[PDB]
């Protein structure tokens, strides 16, 4: 009886610092957009065309972290102590060089990239000097995140969780000082980020080295086999990241047919989703290290128990959020926007979609769990199935025959099927190979 209780408590202590960390980031990024917005239309338009490349940088970013968490934590479970810290140092290296190359390429090809996005001619002039500072903030942020991945892989989410809160507060304070006081404008937004993340790096890196989680003594390390182990998970994981923006991207091509108010409501509605799913998002970062470590230690019974405990939480916890959002949908929508036409559409989104978020959370959880078991291709399938087989077809059918209301209903049944399909893929993955014999 203690076994279930012990696992449930281990999961909670592992997840709650990740949760407060995730909440800190999204909170600041909202306040940061308000700060940039006070500069003018053209600056805010410049930040708008930067988000596409950000989601790609972040896509590559967490793709490596997922591989890092899975490969390293499993080595610890197997008792491969030295191999675990050598990999830690290897991740920091390939992440540092790889992201530096992307950032270098992105800046050189800015003029064509903004062409495919079709930006105003004035926005080009802002990007020329903003992306220099911003891509530097992107590299710095990726590095800090890589240190976090090494911490989580060693069973520590408290330290990255704590530093995410510290890095957000510092970023919040430096924002008005560098943007307005020092009068740097939009550049001050990126500069405030480099310093906030740099200070985060200054704290975590000595701590990680102190516990010998990173090593650069690669004298007895098979580089090619180690890069194969990482790349095996990293490969499909990045592709899995390229799909969720396409869920909201392709949805805005459909949206434009119903006016400028339907689009604005969906931007707000989908923004609510991320906050309504922070618990699952945090669990996506705390569950893989536990699973990966147990897989190496052949604790297969506890893996099944933990995943089911985590599944029961997500299903029940998102049911409550759905219920709360349901009864308070009208004042919530009117609080999120003062545009009456936008509020009414958003009102409909908050009583239809949120009840499906428990199913979508399961889908998210299975993708992260599948990756932790080394099943990166099983994970990619679930992601691709969710997007092209269920979500997009259901959105389009509802939008074609029933308009904005049908589109929301489509999102509902699309998430329910996805989550139920994600669970079955998981069950099938356990029967494909006996985990007791690797």
Burial class (CB in 10 A: 0-12, 13-18, 19+), 353: buried
Q: Max alpha carbon distance in the chain (Å)?
A: 66
* Residues sharing a CB contact under 8 Å with residue 182, sequence separation 6 or more, in sequence order: 188
Query: CA 192 to CA 181: how far, in whole Å?
Result: 12
Query: CA 103 to CA 105: how far, in whole Å?
Result: 5
Query: CA 38 to CA 180: how far, in whole Å?
Result: 10
Q: What is the 3-state secondary structure (H, E, C) of the chain?
A: CHHHHHHHHHHHHHHHHHHHHHHHHHHHHHHHHHHHHCCCHHHHHHHHCCHHHHHHHHHHHHHHHHHHHHHHHHHHHCCCHHHHHHHHHHHHHHHHHHHHHHHHHHHHCHHHHHHHHCCCHHHHHHHHHHHHHHHHHHHHHHHHHHHHHHHHHCCCCHHHHHHHHHHHHHHHHHHHHHHHHCCCCCHHHHHHHHHHHHHHHHHHHHHHHHCCCCCCCCCCCCHHHHHHHHHHHHHHHHHHHCCHHHHHHHHHHHHHHHCHHHHHHHHHHHHHHHHHCHHHHHHHHHHHHHHHHHHHCCCHHHHHHHHHHHHHHHHHHHHHHHHHHHHCHHHHHHHHCCCHHHHHHHHHHHHHCHHHHHHHHHHHHHHHHHHHCCCHHHHHHHHHHHHHHHHHHHHHHHHHHHHHHHHHHHHHHHHHHHHHHHHHHHHHHHHHCCHHHC
User: Does residue 40 come out as left (phi exceeding 0), alpha (psi in the -120 to 50 range) or beta?
Assistant: left
Residues 164/145/241/244 CA torsion (nearest 10 deg): 10
| Beta-carbon count within 10 A of 62 CB | 20
| Beta-carbon count within 10 A of 40 CB | 12
What would the two tokens of residue 343 be? 């509020």
CA angle 91, 93, 96 (to 5 degrees): 105
Contact (CB, 8 A) for 254 and 396: yes
The domains of the chain are located at 1-438
Query: CA 19 to CA 50: how far, in whole Å?
Result: 26
What would the two tokens of residue 115 be? 């062409």
Query: CA 402 to CA 405: how far, in whole Å?
Result: 6
* Residue reference for tokens 């530097």: 136
What would the two tokens of residue 224 be? 């090619």
Nearest to 162, CA basis, from 291, 10, 7, 22: 22
Query: CA 388 to CA 221: how far, in whole Å?
Result: 41
Contact (CB, 8 A) for 67 and 147: no
* Residues sharing a CB contact under 8 Å with residue 286, sequence separation 6 or more, in sequence order: 11, 14, 15, 18, 152, 157
Please, how many CA atoms are within 13 Å of residue 390, restricted to the half-sphere of its CB?
Answer: 24
Residues 353/358/361/362 CA torsion (nearest 10 deg): -130
Long-range contact pairs involving 205-208 (C-beta distance under 8 Å, separation at least 24): 205/147, 207/159, 208/88, 208/147, 208/150, 208/151
This structure was determined by: X-ray
Helix orientation angle between 187-210 and 2-37, rounded to the nearest 10 degrees: 150
Query: CA 270 to CA 263: how far, in whole Å?
Result: 11
Query: CA 346 to CA 405: how far, in whole Å?
Result: 10
Nominal resolution (angstroms): 2.8
């Amino acid at each position: 009886q203690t076994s279930t209780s012990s696992l449930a408590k281990q999961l909670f202590q592992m997840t709650w610092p990740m949760l407060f960390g995730v909440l800190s980031l999204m909170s600041f990024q909202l306040v940061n957009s308000a700060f940039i917005g006070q500069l003018g239309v053209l600056p805010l338009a410049a930040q708008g065309f930067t988000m596409p490349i950000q989601m790609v940088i972040i896509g590559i970013q967490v793709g490596l972290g997922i591989a890092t968490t899975a490969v390293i934590s499993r080595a610890i479970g197997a008792g491969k102590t030295e191999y675990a810290k050598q990999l830690g140092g290897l991740v920091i290296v390939i992440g540092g060089i790889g992201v530096a190359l992307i950032a270098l390429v992105l800046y050189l090809l800015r003029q064509p990239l903004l062409g495919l996005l079709g930006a105003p001619e004035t926005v080009f002039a802002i990007i020329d000097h903003y992306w220099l500072w911003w891509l530097a903030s992107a590299w710095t942020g990726a590095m800090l995140y890589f240190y976090y991945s090494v911490c989580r892989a060693n069973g520590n989410t408290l330290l990255p969780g704590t530093l995410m809160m510290v890095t957000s507060v510092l970023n919040l304070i430096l924002d008005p000082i560098f943007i307005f006081t020092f009068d740097l404008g939009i550049d001050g937004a990126a500069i405030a980020t480099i310093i906030a993340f740099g200070v985060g790096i200054a704290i975590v890196a000595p701590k990680v080295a102190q516990r010998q989680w990173t090593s650069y003594q690669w004298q007895d390390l098979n580089i090619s086999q180690s890069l194969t182990a990482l790349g095996h998970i990293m490969g499909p994981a990045m592709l899995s990241q390229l799909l969720p923006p396409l869920s909201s991207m392709f949805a805005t091509k459909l949206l434009a047919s119903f006016g400028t108010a339907a689009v604005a409501a969906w931007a707000l509605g989908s923004r609510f989703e991320f906050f309504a799913l922070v618990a699952v998002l945090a669990m996506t970062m705390s569950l893989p290290p536990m699973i990966g470590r147990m897989l190496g230690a052949k604790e297969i019974t506890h893996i099944r128990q933990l995943v089911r405990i985590a599944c029961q939480f997500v299903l029940g916890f998102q049911l409550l959020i759905a219920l709360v959002t349901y009864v308070f949908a009208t004042p919530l929508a009117e609080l999120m926007t003062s545009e009456t036409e936008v509020s009414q559409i958003l009102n409909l989104h908050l009583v239809i979609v949120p009840i499906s978020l428990g199913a979508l959370g399961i889908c998210m959880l299975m993708v992260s769990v599948a990756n932790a078991l080394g099943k990166s291709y099983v994970a990619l399938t679930i992601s691709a199935l969710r997007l092209f087989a269920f979500y997009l077809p259901c959105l389009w059918l509802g939008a074609h025959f029933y308009g904005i209301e049908g589109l929301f209903i489509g999102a509902l049944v699309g998430n329910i099927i996805a989550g139920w399909a994600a669970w079955l893929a998981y069950q099938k993955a356990l029967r494909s190979e006996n985990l007791y014999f690797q």
